[PDB]
Nucleic acid binder design. Structure first.
Ligand code: NA
Length: 290
DNA sequence: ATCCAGGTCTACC
DNA sequence: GGTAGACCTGGA
């Protein structure tokens, strides 16, 4: 694990001896949409019906608004703290072409997020800009999510399946999902009536999981890979969006290679570490606007 | 303006 | 199996 012990305080939990953990790298690498950077460098986020604030001071991480029981059963896995990222980076760095990207995002960790929230979040992500994606997700939450209080402000949890099933296509359009509104409505319908079961899909091996996710309207090869990587821990995923495409064309493939060929090339080369390789590549490419 | 952003769906050889 | 057009929105 990438930490050694924790200390439960009155208003938070302190995680000691943390390694491969930097706030900007984790929250701004593209994998999540409900974490917001604070003036002081901290980040406040909403996940699993809770508001959490995270601060990094030296080798210690302070997670506000949670206790030890919550750290053990929810947040330790949320931050993927049981995985040794030093080994991941060591293996990937054997490839000189990946070195610069790994060095740039040394503190990245792949969060273990909720399948339902992630499914809808990435359907919204298609042919969209992150700022807009964040707004749409928060609007959806404000419209039907549970009220949460933290430091004088009311935050809204992501809606339950039952509450989201109450949405009409127009409701999604109002939250500004654009043309994706119909996809979100259809998807929530299939989750609600049980046509597709997320717990079942998450239990499948990487390839079968990917195929089932593509059954959802609005989900293609890229969105499916994001969903299984970010909420189902299927690490052979290699989501090829515009940024990863650019990164791969700069290092491994020609400018006329299809996205499918790029995905297959990446998965073949990086294997079980494809998802991690993709994140370092994405973050470097987007931040440096290659 | 025309293109781009965490693409996907539809029509079609 | 592989491939041009259309598609909400809004900052550059
Ligand atoms: Na689909």
């Amino acid at each position: 694990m990438d930490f050694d012990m924790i200390e439960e305080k009155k208003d938070s939990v302190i995680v000691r001896n943390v390694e491969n953990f930097e706030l900007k790298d984790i929250f701004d690498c593209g994998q999540c949409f409900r974490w917001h950077r604070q003036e002081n460098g901290n980040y406040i986020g909403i996940a699993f019906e809770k508001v959490v604030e995270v601060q990094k001071i030296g080798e210690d991480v302070v997670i506000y608004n949670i206790n030890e029981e919550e750290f053990k059963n929810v947040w330790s896995e949320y931050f993927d703290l049981y995985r040794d990222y030093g080994e991941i980076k060591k293996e990937l760095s054997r490839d000189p072409l990946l070195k610069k990207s790994v060095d740039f995002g040394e503190g990245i960790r792949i969060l273990r997020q909720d399948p339902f929230e992630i499914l809808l979040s990435f359907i919204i992500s298609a042919n969209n800009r992150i700022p807009m994606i964040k707004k749409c997700i928060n609007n959806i939450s404000e419209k039907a999510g549970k009220k949460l209080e933290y430091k004088g402000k009311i935050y809204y949890a992501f809606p339950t399946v039952d509450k989201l099933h109450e949405f009409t296509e127009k409701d999604f359009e109002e939250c500004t999902a654009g043309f994706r509104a119909k996809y979100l409505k259809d998807t929530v319908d299939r989750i609600y009536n049980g046509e597709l079961n997320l717990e079942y899909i998450k239990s499948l091996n990487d390839n079968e999981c990917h195929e089932e996710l593509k059954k959802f309207m609005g989900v293609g090869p890229q969105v499916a890979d994001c969903i299984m990587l970010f909420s189902m821990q299927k690490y052979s995923a290699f989501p090829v969006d515009t940024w990863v495409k650019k990164a791969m064309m700069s290092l491994y493939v020609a400018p006329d290679v299809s996205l499918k060929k790029i995905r297959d090339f990446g998965r073949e080369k990086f294997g079980s570490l494809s998802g991690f390789a993709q994140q370092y590549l994405f973050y470097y490419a987007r931040e440096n606007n290659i």
